[PDB]
Design an enzyme around this catalytic site. Sequence first.
Site, PDB file in Angstrom:
ATOM      1  N   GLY A   1       0.836  -1.178   0.000  1.00 39.53           N
ATOM      2  CA  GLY A   1       0.000   0.000   0.000  1.00 39.53           C
ATOM      3  C   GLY A   1       0.875   1.233   0.000  1.00 39.53           C
TER       4      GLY A   1
ATOM      5  CD  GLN B   1       3.100   5.756   3.260  1.00 46.57           C
ATOM      6  OE1 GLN B   1       2.114   5.241   2.736  1.00 46.57           O
ATOM      7  NE2 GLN B   1       4.140   5.045   3.672  1.00 46.57           N
TER       8      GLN B   1
ATOM      9  CB  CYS C   1       4.466   1.787   7.774  1.00 49.14           C
ATOM     10  SG  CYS C   1       3.845   3.325   7.176  1.00 49.14           S
ATOM     11  CG  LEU C   2       6.720   1.216   1.794  1.00 47.05           C
ATOM     12  CD1 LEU C   2       6.440   1.620   0.342  1.00 47.05           C
ATOM     13  CD2 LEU C   2       7.880   0.256   1.833  1.00 47.05           C
TER      14      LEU C   2
ATOM     15  CG  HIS D   1      -1.482   0.894   7.123  1.00 43.36           C
ATOM     16  ND1 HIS D   1      -0.582   0.346   8.010  1.00 43.36           N
ATOM     17  CD2 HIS D   1      -0.764   1.728   6.338  1.00 43.36           C
ATOM     18  CE1 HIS D   1       0.622   0.831   7.781  1.00 43.36           C
ATOM     19  NE2 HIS D   1       0.537   1.674   6.769  1.00 43.36           N
ATOM     20  CD  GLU D   2      -1.537   2.352   2.656  1.00 49.10           C
ATOM     21  OE1 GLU D   2      -1.156   3.548   2.679  1.00 49.10           O
ATOM     22  OE2 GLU D   2      -0.749   1.410   2.878  1.00 49.10           O
TER      23      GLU D   2
ATOM     24  CG  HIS E   1      -0.460   6.532   5.581  1.00 51.41           C
ATOM     25  ND1 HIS E   1       0.617   6.887   6.371  1.00 51.41           N
ATOM     26  CD2 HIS E   1      -0.275   5.228   5.258  1.00 51.41           C
ATOM     27  CE1 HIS E   1       1.411   5.844   6.518  1.00 51.41           C
ATOM     28  NE2 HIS E   1       0.895   4.825   5.851  1.00 51.41           N
TER      29      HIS E   1
END
Length: 168
Positions: free
Chosen positions: A45, A50, A90-91, A132-133, A136
Amino acid sequence: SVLQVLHIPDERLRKVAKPVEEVNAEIQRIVDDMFETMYAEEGIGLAATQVDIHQRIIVIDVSENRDERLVLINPELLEKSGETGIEEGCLSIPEQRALVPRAEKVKIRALDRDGKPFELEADGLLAICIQHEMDHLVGKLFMDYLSPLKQQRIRQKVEKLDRLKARA
Ligand code: NI
């Protein structure tokens, strides 16, 4: 193009994204880079915020052979139910993982790459992934769900890492 992904404690990560006004070709190359970047970093994702683009865009791809790309533009949560948790990553929080409480089934409305609305019922990895996304997009990270002490530790481990990142 591969865009650069911000990491904590970068405070742009805490910005609330704006609605996409119109799904045009600018918007569709944001989407195309976001996928390219996602696949490059090997995530499942990525939210716009981000990559320092603070509009409500999310790309997700669960598929082994990258043949079921999912685009969520201006996602809204219509329903949720149940509860689950897996050890999320998470990136933007590189190499850290933790169990986060999530709804188990989620129903969303969103627009696709062509500005066409659609509705998606999801459970499993998809539903956790979508939550999760979406978090953000309003400045929420998964470490926000953990104890003060758990958070503290996460912040150090990462800084340490990125210290090496720009390695020189
Ligand atoms: Ni993330």
